[model samples]
Target chain A: EPDLFYILGNKVRRDLLSHLTAMEAYFSLLSSKVSVSSTAVAKHLKIMEREGVLQSYEKKYYKISIAKSYVFTLTPEMFWYKGLDLGDAELRDFEISLSGLDTEPSTLKEMITDFIKANKELEKVLEAFKTIESYRSSLMRKIKEAYLKEIGDMTQLAILHYLLLNGRATVEELSDRLNLKEREVREKISEMARFVPVKIINDNTVVLDEDQIL
Target chain B: EPDLFYILGNKVRRDLLSHLTAMEAYFSLLSSKVSVSSTAVAKHLKIMEREGVLQSYYKISIAKSYVFTLTPEMFWYKGLDLGDAELRDFEISLSGLDTEPSTLKEMITDFIKANKELEKVLEAFKTIESYRSSLMRKIKEAYLKEIGDMTQLAILHYLLLNGRATVEELSDRLNLKEREVREKISEMARFVPVKIINDNTVVLDEDQIL
Candidate 1:
């Protein structure tokens, strides 16, 4: 419906709205569970209020409610996360039941690789990251930043949320903790950069900070 | 791949296989959980065995060992009661989330109803007992006697497995359970031409018959 990507991107907006959807709450409580820095959370909340995705009323302290449009629902196709909506919130609620993703899926790989094959093979175009692994990690960072660019996918947002909560993280830690592939971990961190700033810890780890931006 | 209908049609097969995949058991033991007749259970085992989807052997004198083919890992599709292959499975699975029948979902009413759309919003499905009672009983009996068609058996088998199903939402059960497991109980008795005295309990003593 309303630019599905916008409706679905930006982890902060989605998380904020999801919480509001459950029950209207204020920054005093919501900021703590948001999995982002307090200042970052505040700025994004202000932006969402400005865009009319949320309405804030000062009942002593500013409490929030989701915009009426949100009741219309944004699906995976409507939302930009991973092309289709997997009801990421529902999946997150049931994360404990997931079969730990051990085997790398050929279909997943094939689909992503097809996108890479068509697009100018950005690894060749970018000079900063030399090896494929390095390039992939960088791409993940860019994708994460893109998530911040709008109400992004809940699933990916959840992953980067972990990186922020930890301050810094390695690919193996991400893969084990998130039950994603080491390569997928590499790719997710690689793609985010336009929004939140990130850094590389050694050759294989990802670091998130407030100031650093692509 | 097999015929789409064959792949989609078998719910009992899926329920039976689900138990086998997760648990190890023989006919009587599996029957206790699946609640199908041992005869039907044995028949399904034979079909799956012929398909090479499963393998079995003996563990004890009376019991048997049945293991599933995990290599060709099967995933349950979004709207499916049965397990499917992974590729098409998740595509269907992810999209089907949120109970959207999808834009392309075929509505039987739109396709078959004599009533025009938007005119009759009061339409609703019939109950299980009503559906069962509505069947042409004497016609079905006559058909069973004269019909030499194997297709007829397959059709009856589908009816048995499902109990009471609708023309649309083909998979949803309307089972009233007034007659529990009425599908199998009804169809099996109709099809088979065999008779025996019901001796409520088996006489275990050897000398009585000997």
Candidate 2:
């Protein structure tokens, strides 16, 4: 069972644990390979030890292995080496630690391909977003340089376009989504509502009913 | 079609591209969401434009869709402006372009796990490799001893522990997978000078006396 710290920080520790379990790496080798340091590795080992999930034995080297006191779900071949080296039968039982680890992602080749696809999608969306920004800026640039009359028909088109995008919008939603303000939205709606083929059910709702609205 | 630049500096670009595809966004909407500036985004747009993969037109805001230059792999409602907007066939059949997408890693999750089991001994071998270094450092810490004593033992054991496994009885005693056991197994010879492999199941040499 996970304690408080394990549950909270297990986000990364779990991933690190999976990597470590998958590749039987020692501290120095892990430091060279993984994106972590020896200190953090030692800390995790200490926590695992205190949790009774693993044990460290100081033989010729500090050998870390699964602990006897630890408890987990039983599997088929967990008890492999309890022998007294003298044909010990009762000392041996069958218990594999990860034999039934079925849910783990077992991809071998091109493991990083999913990451690549996700990355490519991100770039396409960003490119489209940039195009929208350029078009928005281009409109503003045209507005700044020329007469309001020159862009009247186009600006009306722009208003209708804005309305289409920002349906039944609050001033905040309008400003946020269409880059327009409360006063601007209100005045534009007021000016166009009488003549334009639309009805303002309220401040936010612009109902398009075709009668003498055009 | 990605060029040399895309191929060479692809790590960041790939990530950026994927992030964009996950969202429904235009420039300002995305500029704040993503950590990059709009100007930098515009530069990417120039590349995409050159590739002829995507296009943008003025809407109430900046709406985007795929260009016909692409595989016409996208669609949109074309009759939205008319109040009684009827669905019009605004289909684009993208003719094949000379451009080709860059080579990328293909991954299916199932195999990654299997290889771990296949290379189990190798995985353990890496850990065992570090054990010697740790042992040396501890020796120095405990007795101020030099690693000179265990250097030969380490090399010999390394060769023994990491070799092409052939001897089944030895591997079974070692408790390792036959394919994963590390040993410098050359051609096994019987007393009759036969060769064996496959965890010594196939006899090759006089060593078949086992």
Candidate 3:
């Protein structure tokens, strides 16, 4: 319900979750693991606990206690890192899963449990992305700062995310996906080039970037 | 080098190569299959032809591009970002835990297929690997409901959702005749397959939480 990006946009919080997910740890371990100060770790821990991503023990350390459906709630930032975005139907599926936690009797619950088990594999992959983001905070911050001059202004970043993830796009695809004019999309890319390099290919008609944006 | 990374980056071009690799298609067919306009497809085709990833030849039914063939490198690069050793390990993990549930396994597989596009195998090993307390809450809620009465159900739900509510809180929410929520929870606890953490406390198990 809260802004997933705004919350997860902080690298330490994500790293803390990544560590907690791997194993339950005390402050010393969590701090040392993520290489953040213990004070900052505690601060991030409290924030995550408030967000229901974790829970504290009897005035001691803490462990993961993520809300049941928050795991599947992928944000645009998360998708952008992967060079993909969800369509209406896929987004609807995420919305449905978030609201509908009541797994039907018999097979459905079984399936969810099993799927969760399998989905652990994806956890490593997602965590790797977070690690990369944390390591590349300078680049990530520049990208964030540039795209987020105003509220809900992720369009340019979304374009860059798509291009980085997919490796290439045309004005047509960008315009079609983002619901903008071809010229408008072109101008936005021009604007983006001022921050991060946006490679213009195919005689300036196609956009391609080989670098990993995360 | 002609920027191997750039060549493999665009999803459209990758898809175009994938289609041609699978079967030969002319411009219209390739455009339709890849869901881009023919003009766009031609542009991609032209770029790809320039890159030497594919070649086209004339055919009777179609225009000057009846046949399109893939280069060997196309096949090699196709699997580049799809999945890797981590993905294989992850897939193996999907083989089910020590106690595999058939219905759950089938549905999980179905889920993977349905949202296959959203999840990339490259995402393997990138998530925070930790105890899934979130899932623990759900599974425990289901189990508690099956064993408990309305008051017990409310107690379990409240405790799991709110990370342990008081006995009075459960009684107030459910308004039970038994009056004492702990008594009902205790009674329900004696019967379920899981362990009893405590009388007032809703329990969590190692196997159950994960």
Candidate 4:
């Protein structure tokens, strides 16, 4: 495991890592892309190498390096990649990391130790997090498109409008207000939670995670 | 309704209208706030006055050549102005919804089919017309709401489930500043019983939950 936080936090390093992970590139090319001075880039590479997160060598084009590329690309490793498909295995890995996070102590040393223990799984958590975010964004995009289509059925849209105007509602209230069955309202909430920023509390009240909605 | 298309159509005029709506001000004062040339401000104010959307007068050293006054109906007019196009578009957009694919699976299929970037945008034109129109409406809606803003709602919603949390915890999940989280919680405390305890822990008042 790299200095997981360190590798992920710095944008210049991320750019360097991204470039090197894609293919070997000269120091100058990366230096320009990241807009860091060559000296800073060299120091960055040196630190990454010392941390065992990277390996470098000299060539005619000049210094080149590679990030962890054997099993997975560096972007995913650093948790910046947004395009990972969340398969069952990945989902399980995410669940595991979230579980691990709950039990892990809050101390820095313990957290760092936990990081090393589940560094790989942490990527799954990050991937899952990004997956949800993109899923939400894409769903909103579809909603915007779908909102205009007038395809049919007013149930979901009515549910969305109620939550949109009022912020939150209960399944019972939704059923009463919309003149729909409780089971159908829950079903609709379940459908929306698949991609939208929606949540069901105790399978009763439907709350909108407004931050993610817009 | 106010000529929302005309008023919102120009940047300088929109700024002038907004400033005038919030408070009465001299042309120079308004010009400073909007960062527009005095001449431009004067021109906008004149147009608003000519349209009978505003009334101007003179007063004191304050030897007031009064630039304006707004009645309560002006605020009402202001409300209608936003809905002028945006509210209509939101309705138009929703009306465009296809009712057949009531299920999520079908919705997903329709989206998957239109996944191309260009196709997605072109589909928006079915109701929204142009990207600019959509953008203008979106921007207006963000500031128009009285029940108000997404951040405040998200904070309350998160607390609604968790019941209590440290400010740091809330900020981390929301990807905001601890200070920002604190301030919003304080603002929300007006209606929602969100309390900051010992300066760090944030708790929801179940009794005050709106």
Best by DockQ: 3
| lDDT, candidate 4, A123-174, per-residue tens | 4433433333233333433454565464433466556644532456888877
Off by over 4 Å in 4: A21-24, A57-214, B1-210
Candidate 2, residue A207: the lDDT equals: 44
Candidate 1 structure quality by residue, lDDT tens digits, B1-210:
222223112546544442342222112223233467779867866665554445664111111111100000010111111112121101101111222212211111111111121111111001111121112222233344454432233233233222222322111122223233334333434443211124211111112112
lDDT-superior candidate, 2 or 3:
3
Encode model 3's per-residue lDDT on A1-214: one tens digit a residue. 3233334546576556544433336776567665557888878777767866567777377775422112221110111112211111111111111112223334324533443553444444444323222222222233344345532346666675455334567888777655467888888877766555566677556553323221
True contacts kept of 3: 0.02
Q: What is the lDDT of residue A86 in candidate 4?
A: 23
Give the best candidate by TM-score. Answer: 3
Could you give candidate 1's per-residue lDDT for residues A1-214 as a string of tens digits? 2232243335565555544432325666667546678888788777765655456655423333221111110111110011111111221110011122212323322222222221122112111111211222223334344454564554456555455323467777667644457887666665554433555668986876433221
Scored on chain A only, each candidate's TM-score is: 0.30, 0.29, 0.32, 0.31
Identify the superior model by lDDT, candidate 1 or candidate 3: 3
CAPRI rating of model 4: incorrect
Candidate 3, which segments miss by more than 4 Å at Cα?
A1-139, A142-181, A187-214, B1-179, B193-201, B207-210
Give the per-residue Cα lDDT of candidate 2 at A26. Answer: 53
True contacts kept of each: 0.00, 0.00, 0.02, 0.00
- Interface DockQ of each model: 0.01, 0.02, 0.03, 0.01
The local distance difference test score of each candidate is 0.32, 0.30, 0.40, 0.42
Measured with C-alpha atoms, the lDDT of residue B80 in candidate 2 is 11
Residue B39 of model 2 has an lDDT of 88
| lDDT value for model 1 | 0.32
Complex DockQ, candidate 1: 0.01
Docking quality band of candidate 1, CAPRI definitions: incorrect
